[PDB]
Design a protein around this ligand. Sequence first.
Ligand SMILES: O=P(O)(O)OC[C@@H](O)[C@H]1O[C@H](O)[C@@H](O)[C@@H](O)[C@@H]1O
Ligand SMILES: O=P(O)(O)OC[C@@H](O)[C@H]1O[C@H](O)[C@@H](O)[C@@H](O)[C@@H]1O
Ligand SMILES: O=P(O)(O)OC[C@@H](O)[C@H]1O[C@H](O)[C@@H](O)[C@@H](O)[C@@H]1O
Ligand SMILES: O=P(O)(O)OC[C@@H](O)[C@H]1O[C@H](O)[C@@H](O)[C@@H](O)[C@@H]1O
Lengths: 194, 197, 197, 194
Amino acid sequence: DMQHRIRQLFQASIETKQQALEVLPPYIEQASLVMVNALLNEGKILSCGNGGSAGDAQHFSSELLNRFERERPSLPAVALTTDSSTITSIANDYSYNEVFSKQIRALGQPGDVLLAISTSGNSANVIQAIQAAHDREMLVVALTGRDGGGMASLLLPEDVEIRVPSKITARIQEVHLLAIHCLCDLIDRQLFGS
Amino acid sequence: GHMDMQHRIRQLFQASIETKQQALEVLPPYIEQASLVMVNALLNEGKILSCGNGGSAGDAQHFSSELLNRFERERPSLPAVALTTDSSTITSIANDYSYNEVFSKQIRALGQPGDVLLAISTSGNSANVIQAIQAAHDREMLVVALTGRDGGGMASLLLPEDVEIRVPSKITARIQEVHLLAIHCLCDLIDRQLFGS
Amino acid sequence: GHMDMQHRIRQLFQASIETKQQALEVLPPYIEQASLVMVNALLNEGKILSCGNGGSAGDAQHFSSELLNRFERERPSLPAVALTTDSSTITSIANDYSYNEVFSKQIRALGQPGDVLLAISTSGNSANVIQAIQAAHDREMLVVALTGRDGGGMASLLLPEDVEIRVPSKITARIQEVHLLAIHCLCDLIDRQLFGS
Amino acid sequence: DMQHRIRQLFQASIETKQQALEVLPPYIEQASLVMVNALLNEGKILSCGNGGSAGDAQHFSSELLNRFERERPSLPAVALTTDSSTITSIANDYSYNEVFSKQIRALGQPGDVLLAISTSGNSANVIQAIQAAHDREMLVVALTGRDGGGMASLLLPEDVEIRVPSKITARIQEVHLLAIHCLCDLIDRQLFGS
Ligand SMILES: O=P(O)(O)OC[C@@H](O)[C@H]1O[C@H](O)[C@@H](O)[C@@H](O)[C@@H]1O
Ligand SMILES: O=P(O)(O)OC[C@@H](O)[C@H]1O[C@H](O)[C@@H](O)[C@@H](O)[C@@H]1O
Ligand SMILES: O=P(O)(O)OC[C@@H](O)[C@H]1O[C@H](O)[C@@H](O)[C@@H](O)[C@@H]1O
Ligand SMILES: O=P(O)(O)OC[C@@H](O)[C@H]1O[C@H](O)[C@@H](O)[C@@H](O)[C@@H]1O
């Protein structure tokens, strides 16, 4: 029974990826171009998310700040989910909704990029992070799922949404991780060739 | 050299120095009781969980790292865990439920009878820490509360076996400075009591 | 639309999909044994410690947060602790001694007989994780190792009661993708076994 | 006996502060001006350190990104000690000595400031962080103790050292924390008046 349940999970994950391969590629490519153009212009990338998505935020920032595959220079990315003093104080002093937006308002420079990760598209703090990136004239790459939630209504024409065609948070995170490896691979290829 | 700046810095140093002098007059008894609660917990194979917000979250992990690595003398690592460092845990709990549960949910899972909670707050009024204390009580843990001002809601929740180290100040930055020194004192007393000398 | 980019993305998706298909053929038995080791530890009031480097450190805290908060079903928080999140602890241990001791020193302090170590490495060759396994053994803990390639030095250290989930791939990013899914499977099996349904 | 030991610690801490008040103020002021000038020119501040010093690094970044005392806008600071994926991968892949320097090379922009914290002045990774800030044309504020170690030999004329007159790490960290509150207070006063 457990073996069957595991297979069923592997299979659902495989199917979700096959469904995502049918619609995500163009958005994944557009998002990598948005990020490469920012990196080429002294810009940096900020990432935020909650739970497994906070793990994706820092997964992305480490691939860039250290490396993805080939040896190359560190690239500028900052995860907004890791400084516990900043996060706890903001949430404590005002509200949890401001933990990312408040850092973006300080760190965001025009032309920088915000990688906003949410499987529901409905996390208040990421919705507010997107508003704050817009206030700093930043472009937004949003990794989402379901119907895109409030995050999708905030996206502007230059922003890019990568909406996983799934309603299951765990499946969604699995594609998000793959999507991030694609972005890291495409950024390296674009900046340093194949 | 600029007028206001050199004056201001001197004024801040003096206020930090004076605050420690007042604290020196009332905190020693509490700092000692608190180190004994911690030492007993450690001897009984228990562990210490710490929590706080902002500068206090910095203190929570400063404490944890002093024990897990070392304070001064070379000795084995001691069991402490700061409840403020796992961003996935913290963000998912706050995002799914409420920021008020970030520490308490971890304590309910991790806390064991006889463990100790180091609850840090300069006002004594942070809801998450207040809920952490209630969770430590529900897990039959003792609480060492580092506070300031009038103790706030944290103070009224403390039980007879708990220990409060209330800094005699209303200024958060002054209270944090004294909390850091108090933590260095607890680490020092814990080594003294556990390994002697 | 650009030639190479759309081709490359498709190629990466396919390689991720194929890797999962190969993993689907060999990992289920191990994933199940590993969930049973974890479930037994949790039932016996033990806890799970997780560690790893880079993407694997992300996985270590993803695992910890799934248990401390929730995976899918509403249920009480479960005891897990990622050994990779406390920066004060990690930096002081690496700075004073060696980066190789960052996990092992925490395990020696925190680990208890019957606890479980989730050791994550795509090569199986990270020294700190290798030393973490040796420390879990010294604390009479069982080890669940998420690896890849040929298992590396981590594989040769495993004992008969330990469980290895070795992804059939040599590519780190592919192995991490399968490690994430494996973790979702363990969380799913842990809830199933602990609360039924 | 324990009461006496505690008093002795409080007293040693008080004395160390009194000794620091005799020599630190000019450096503390110079460091706040260096930081204010960077913030006034779209620059940001990066902080790093180990152990209690990593705690100071993020203490500083939170005071700026959230707030110190008065309500004011978030200021740009990034602690390089908090993203565990970045830190572990760099140390794992190369060596622990590169955990900060590698992030500075990516994130550092000319005119930014590095707050490098070390009670000994001799931590390899902070020594290397200072070299990397110099490569990015950044100024350095170094919080140190003892004789300044390798960090002090790397400082350039525009950099500022705040060397606590103590050899005891715990005393040194106590002054560092006070020094950081001074910097936060001076930055607020300079930027938004008294
Ligand atoms: O993906 P979001 O809708 O932005 O929510 C993220 C987190 O709050 C977590 O929610 C649940 O607890 C789980 O699905 C987690 O895995 C998720 O990270
Ligand atoms: O010390 P508490 O009252 O529990 O509050 C802690 C934090 O929310 C922070 O509040 C303000 O932002 C500042 O005073 C911080 O230094 C403090 O850590
Ligand atoms: O998976 P390991 O062999 O134990 O190594 C983990 C990390 O050091 C990182 O190494 C490289 O930088 C990359 O492949 C990362 O994705 C990986 O986490
Ligand atoms: O202050 P450093 O010389 O840069 O060293 C920092 C850390 O390695 C730690 O060293 C010892 O373990 C203790 O003194 C810690 O408090 C300190 O943070």
